[PDB]
Amino acid sequence: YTEEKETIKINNIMIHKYTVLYTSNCIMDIYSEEEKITCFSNRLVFLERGVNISVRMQKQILSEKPYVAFALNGDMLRHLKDALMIIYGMSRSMSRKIMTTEVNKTLLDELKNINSHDNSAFISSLIYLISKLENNEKIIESIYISSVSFFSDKVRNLIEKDLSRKWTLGIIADAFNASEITIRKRLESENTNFNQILMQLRMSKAALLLLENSYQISQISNMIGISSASYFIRIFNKHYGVTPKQFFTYFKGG
Amino acid sequence: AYTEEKETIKINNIMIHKYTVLYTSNCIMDIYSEEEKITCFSNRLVFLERGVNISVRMQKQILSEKPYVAFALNGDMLRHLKDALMIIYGMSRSMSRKIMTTEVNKTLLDELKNINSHDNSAFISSLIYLISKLENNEKIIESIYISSVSFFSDKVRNLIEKDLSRKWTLGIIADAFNASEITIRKRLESENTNFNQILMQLRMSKAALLLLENSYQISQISNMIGISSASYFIRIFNKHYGVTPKQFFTYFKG
């Protein structure tokens, strides 16, 4: 159905990598921490690492993917933070975490020429683009804030070692030399818990593997640690608010 | 009859005290140093390593404009630019690695036109952006690195720059460094200069810059740099550069 191919609402997206998104083919409402940030078409979007957002997207042209996104891996992000410090010196609201800006003509050119196979060129383009943006303080702040490795990041790193394993709070506490209460209370001071972390890791991986179109749902369910393919579909639909099929159809066409 | 072509000038004993990116807006320039030659044609960027001594033969196309547009990085700027370049590209003698030219396309020229020498962070971003767009850019980053390290003749120059008018001597330099004259002469010889050359290159560089400001009379400039007589200044300047203060001035301003 054609209205299903333009408009989708997706809940509980966790931004695990610092992300620059260009709304090439969509208008997008971002809902996080009871705020609403509408990004129109042809705007840049900077999503701080660690935000959990819900998104309502409306495509401009139905036959093409909604947006083009750049996710910085942890290395890239470190170097980019380091260079930004040297260039600008050393030194929260949802609006300090998710920011939208207009992209002019030339920026749009360098935006399209991004290599993403060449680290040095890619950091150079980002530095260039950041310098050309006004009020780029909030954006540099955002890159800084997102470069510090919190405790929930150690927990994610532990879990990412073996995403299929049947993790428990006890297992986490063993691996860290603490009691369950210590880890719970340490994760509670960052407003998460262990189940939240584990579910967001599994569901992020599952989303990404779905878009490859190279693994069967039963395969994806096993790769992320869920016993049943029919149970994974229940969980994914409960989590994201759309089914693997509908999710996939939105980003890879019908 | 010696008909002087005012498009053409030959200038000897130029010491590049600051890392310099030069765009040949209105000239072709033959660079002669260390018995080597590098011709830079019109519409080219020229990267001049800090510390090279060159002779230049310049041919203007249009007499009403200055031969070139140059960006000389002060010691601060160069520091940061090298540091950020190390983070973006990683850590790591012939004339061909010291002076390099590349062709200037549309995009490069566009950012070239917007370089703000009042915003340091914008300026380093521009140089970073521009360096990324150059092929064979290894030689250039090598050159920026080499030119960032403070050699001993740089310590001597820092001492002298404090009071360029003082009647400096090798002995005075040797006291200030807690060393013998032979140590300083030989330390300066292992960097291919001597104390008299450093002092002459400092005065004549300053005198060149002051001439181009067009705000000081020759006798003022001579006194500001430490030369007793204005007529003696003209003698020294002409012997050093191979051109008189009047002819030099006319070539770069009006």
From Swiss-Prot, chain B:
<dbReference type="Pfam" id="PF12833">
    <property type="entry name" value="HTH_18"/>
</dbReference>
<dbReference type="GO" id="GO:0042803">
    <property type="term" value="F:protein homodimerization activity"/>
</dbReference>
<dbReference type="InterPro" id="IPR018060">
    <property type="entry name" value="HTH_AraC"/>
</dbReference>
<feature type="DNA-binding region" description="H-T-H motif">
    <location>
        <begin position="218"/>
        <end position="241"/>
    </location>
</feature>
<keyword id="KW-0614">Plasmid</keyword>
<feature type="DNA-binding region" description="H-T-H motif">
    <location>
        <begin position="171"/>
        <end position="192"/>
    </location>
</feature>
<feature type="domain" description="HTH araC/xylS-type">
    <location>
        <begin position="154"/>
        <end position="251"/>
    </location>
</feature>
<comment type="function">
    <text>A transcription factor required for the expression of the CS1 and CS2 adhesins of enterotoxigenic E.coli. Required for expression of pilins and some outer membrane lipoproteins. Represses expression of nlpA.</text>
</comment>
<keyword id="KW-0449">Lipoprotein</keyword>
<protein>
    <recommendedName>
        <fullName>DNA-binding dual transcriptional regulator Rns</fullName>
    </recommendedName>
</protein>
<keyword id="KW-0805">Transcription regulation</keyword>
<feature type="binding site">
    <location>
        <position position="72"/>
    </location>
    <ligand>
        <name>decanoate</name>
    </ligand>
</feature>
<dbReference type="InterPro" id="IPR009057">
    <property type="entry name" value="Homeodomain-like_sf"/>
</dbReference>
<comment type="subunit">
    <text>Homodimer; each subunit binds one decanoate molecule.</text>
</comment>
<keyword id="KW-0843">Virulence</keyword>
<dbReference type="GO" id="GO:0005737">
    <property type="term" value="C:cytoplasm"/>
</dbReference>
<feature type="binding site">
    <location>
        <position position="17"/>
    </location>
    <ligand>
        <name>decanoate</name>
    </ligand>
</feature>
<dbReference type="InterPro" id="IPR020449">
    <property type="entry name" value="Tscrpt_reg_AraC-type_HTH"/>
</dbReference>
<dbReference type="GO" id="GO:0005504">
    <property type="term" value="F:fatty acid binding"/>
</dbReference>
<keyword id="KW-0010">Activator</keyword>
<dbReference type="GO" id="GO:0003700">
    <property type="term" value="F:DNA-binding transcription factor activity"/>
</dbReference>
<dbReference type="InterPro" id="IPR018062">
    <property type="entry name" value="HTH_AraC-typ_CS"/>
</dbReference>
<keyword id="KW-0804">Transcription</keyword>
<keyword id="KW-0238">DNA-binding</keyword>
<keyword id="KW-0963">Cytoplasm</keyword>
<dbReference type="GO" id="GO:0043565">
    <property type="term" value="F:sequence-specific DNA binding"/>
</dbReference>
<keyword id="KW-0678">Repressor</keyword>
